[PDB]
Amino acid sequence: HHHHHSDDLTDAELAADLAADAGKLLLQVRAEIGFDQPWTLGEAGDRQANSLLLRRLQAERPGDAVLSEEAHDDLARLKSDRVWIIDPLDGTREFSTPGRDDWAVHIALWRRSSEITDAAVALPARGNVVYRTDTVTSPGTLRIAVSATRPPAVLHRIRQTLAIQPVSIGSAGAKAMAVIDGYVDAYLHAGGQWEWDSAAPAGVMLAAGMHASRLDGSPLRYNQLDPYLPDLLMCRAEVAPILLGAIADAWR
Ligand SMILES: Nc1ncnc2c1ncn2[C@@H]1O[C@H](COP(=O)(O)O)[C@@H](O)[C@H]1O
């Protein structure tokens, strides 16, 4: 009784519960199927996590649109004021590899403003820790998390002027949460990505009072017709001017 203000969860509570629940299911799938066929393992994780998440979002938020990596996109979301942007399993490659803990579940709520208002990132292999927008708290040399698979070429240019050690990690969620944790100073990506890769990490990053933008400094924009969103910078606030500047100076 008495809900929240303005099966009875706030949007942030639901984001966190969805992320944890999908996390537990993924851990079950990993234990059941095992690692002999990494392709089969990854496919099962993607498909089963997606199924759980879509079932629960229909049951618990039947009026909300959903954009998932693992489902067709009917574009009804473009007319909605409330859109869940989900990556049922981010870092499928890493999930499918024995002993790797750098994979995530991304659950973001986009709300139309006159933008990512609530979000959670689960790292199921790290004790199923769930970072959430409603509980997350607020220069000589830089540690920068980059893709273990497709690191951005632009890094090479900025390293001519800034002392940087790249830290190879799988998953956008894992790299963003390494920034929150203080394991790295920044997460930098370019060369391609999708909205569900960055929406929940961005929500958490901004809620923690940290920086999250495009490489050119402009805001990350979601619920776009084309959900391709190819580059990002997520970092401590104090680090953003240094990196955005170096990126800008790499141009000219
Ligand atoms: N160049 C790229 N184009 C499209 N998607 C990417 C690219 N690099 C990374 N991703 C996606 O971003 C997420 C994290 O990737 P990674 O940081 O490489 O583990 C995964 O969903 C990848 O498929």
Ligand SMILES: [Mg+2]
């Ligand atoms: Mg995925």
Ligand SMILES: [Mg+2]
């Ligand atoms: Mg992904």
